[PDB]
Ligand binder design. Structure first.
Ligand SMILES: *[B]([O])([O])C1=[C][C]=[C]C(C(=O)[N][C]C2=[C][C]=[C]O2)=[C]1
Length: 244
């Protein structure tokens, strides 16, 4: 019973209050809706940053480059965060957004195979260039927030060109929140090596009854904001629209 005018104002305000510029795109069935305080972001291109982990994992598992239970050893060298100085599964690495695990996986896959799986999946601008281990962080691979939500819609519905079983395994890695019988599956993205910095939270809500509502939040990370603003805004918006 809320006017759409009021949903629009309430969601814009969640971005206004964090003092950033951003958008969240929601997909109900085949219908895309854009909210936020910077609507024109919707079809601009940004690096996927760690959102790429979802595709990177799909590629690695499908092509037998790791298993769901394989433990990637920490090599013992100092890491940018101490939470990374441990051995982990791809799943654990997904939750921690541990890039060196995912770069290990990228190296196993190899530049050639990576390029072909990324052209095959039609992901973003599909260009990975010559560096197998940072293409999703500093370019040249770029994707828009529309493409990101459509990629989430595909994964959520198992429509990507990977075995059903590969898709279920990557989806088990993605559960970040349970809120009143709804489950939020998603991956965060933080473009730290680019100016300005991009922040993403891409996924879908799986409702009490099996409807799945894909979404993609996309904003600018400002000097010392924390990661969880991405989540917080996503959750405020989703609740505001009665999706969760
Ligand atoms: B991801 O979006 O969660 C993510 C995690 C850790 C590190 C990065 C990253 O963007 N590193 C970039 C780096 C390369 C040169 C300078 O900084 C992303």
């Amino acid at each position: 019973h809320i006017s759409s005018q009021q949903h629009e104002k309430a969601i814009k305000s969640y971005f206004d209050e964090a003092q950033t510029q951003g958008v969240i795109i929601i997909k109900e069935g085949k219908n895309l809706s854009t909210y936020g305080n910077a609507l024109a972001r919707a079809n601009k291109e940004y690096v996927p940053a760690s959102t790429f982990k979802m595709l990177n994992a799909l590629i690695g598992l499908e092509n037998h480059k790791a298993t769901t239970n394989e433990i990637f050893k920490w090599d013992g060298k100092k890491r940018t965060y101490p939470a990374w100085e441990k051995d982990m599964t791809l799943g654990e690495a997904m939750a921690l957004s541990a890039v060196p695990v995912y770069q290990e996986l990228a190296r196993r896959t190899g530049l050639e195979l990576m390029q072909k799986e990324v052209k095959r999946v039609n992901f973003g601008n599909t260009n990975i260039g010559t560096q197998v281990d940072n293409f999703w962080l500093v370019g040249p691979l770029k994707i828009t927030p529309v493409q990101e939500v459509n990629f989430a819609d595909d994964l959520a519905h198992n429509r990507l060109p990977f075995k059903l079983e590969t898709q279920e395994e990557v989806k088990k890695m993605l559960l970040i929140k349970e809120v009143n019988g709804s489950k939020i599956y998603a991956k965060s993205g933080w473009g730290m090596g680019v100016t300005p910095q991009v922040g993403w939270l891409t996924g879908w809500v799986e409702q009490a009854n099996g409807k799945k509502i894909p979404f993609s939040l996309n904003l600018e990370m400002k000097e010392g904001m924390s990661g969880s603003i991405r989540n917080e805004i996503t959750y405020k918006s989703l609740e505001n629209l009665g999706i969760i």
